[PDB]
Amino acid sequence: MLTEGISIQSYDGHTFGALVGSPAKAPAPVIVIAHEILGVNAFMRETVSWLVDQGYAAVCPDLYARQAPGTALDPQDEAQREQAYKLWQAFDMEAGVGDLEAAIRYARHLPYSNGKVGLVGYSLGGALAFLVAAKGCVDRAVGYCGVGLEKQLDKVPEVKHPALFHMGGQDHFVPAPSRQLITEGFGANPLLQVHWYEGAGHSFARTGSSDYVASAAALANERTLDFLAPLQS
């Protein structure tokens, strides 16, 4: 689902839509939400609603629009999960970073913006959140359950603003050596935080997922909100 009429244009003239939640009161910091591999779906609607309830505005851009505008896949359905994996496999990560940077510039200038912008990413978006943190166009970045962080360690010293990451201890995408590499590498830069959630799998914060773990999701989400709160006026 996207908000009708919202259009953000990127570095290369590509345009894309977004689901937008205006804040309960103006002004407010704006959070750009980077979605999972399933597009702007029910979990994104939930996440927009949650952040608005917590005193933010929210913008969730259609990152798959370079491939298939308006993707919104239900992870309960095998056919739709297969489409998600096919889209992820083809996903251009550098163009994703560019599109998020465009969405962050757009968010900064919204009429109710207090001039501060955060980024919260999940899954595909959790990996993009690190890349965006390395580029420095956001005030604070959060990534849940990103894949492949252990291959981006050269970017650790490039991070110049705070970024927070939440990672499952039983995430098959992040086996023990990868966890050690991330823990040691990210540890070198005190602007980064990475928290591991023992007993929690890859999609531990996605409501409805068989991976969901209420206690771990609760702690990760509490940490996210405390980390974003300094952006509020």
SS (H, E, C) 122-191: ECHHHHHHHHHHHHCCCCEEEEECCCCHHHCHHHHHHCCCCEEEEEECCCCCCCHHHHHHHHHHHHCCCC
Among the options 35, 99, 202, 211, which is catalytic? 202
Whether 171 sits among the annotated catalytic residues: the reply is yes
Name the resolution in angstroms.
Answer: 1.7
Check which CATH number belongs to the domain holding 117 and give it. 3.40.50.1820
Q: How was this structure determined?
A: X-ray
The number of distinct structural domains making up the chain is 1
Q: Measuring CA to CA, which residue among 53, 65, 54 is closest to residue 6?
A: 65
**Domain assignment of residue 118, given as a range:** 1-233
Among the options 62, 99, 139, 171, which is catalytic? 171
Helix or strand (DSSP H, E) at 21: strand 18-21
DSSP 42-76: HHHHHHHHHHHHTT-EEEEE-GGGGTSTT-B--TT
Asked if 195 and 165 count as a contact pair (C-beta separation under 8 A), the reply is yes
* Rounded Cα gap, residues 118 and 140, in angstroms: 5
**3 state DSSP class of 113:** strand
9 φ, ψ (degrees, to nearest 5): -110, 140
